[PDB]
């Protein structure tokens, strides 16, 4: 084994797995990591990109390394929870709200 002479040329295996859809999970798309729902998109890519971006410079679309189908990345449902109460001096029933 000889190092400190050239960049990376030969590496080892990667142990790829299957694909899931319609769920927000963490992914490793050739170095890109993030959480988002894997959904089929409508746009078309030229045959030399790997992933796309937006005005926020974040991950919104990616090309799978196994096939030629374009994917879309969107985060799932999240937000700050809100509460509605009449006060402890009047009643005890509460109405929880998702914003």
């Amino acid at each position: 084994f000889e190092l400190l002479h050239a960049p990376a040329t030969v590496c080892g295996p990667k142990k790829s797995t299957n694909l899931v859809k319609n769920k927000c999970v963490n992914f490793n798309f050739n170095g890109l990591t993030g959480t988002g729902v894997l959904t089929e998109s409508n746009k078309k890519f030229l045959p030399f990109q790997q992933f796309g971006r937006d005005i926020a410079d974040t991950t919104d679309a990616v090309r799978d390394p196994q096939t030629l189908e374009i994917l879309d990345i969107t985060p799932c449902s999240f937000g700050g929870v809100s509460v509605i109460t009449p006060g402890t001096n009047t009643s005890n029933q509460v109405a929880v709200l998702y914003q």
Partner: peptide, 21 residues
């Protein structure tokens, strides 16, 4: 009215946008 219609047509992560009340 057509005035507000024309006015509405004239004018155009981890982040949440609260809708107006």
């Amino acid at each position: 009215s057509p005035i507000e219609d024309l006015l509405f047509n004239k004018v155009t992560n981890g982040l949440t946008v609260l809708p107006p009340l």
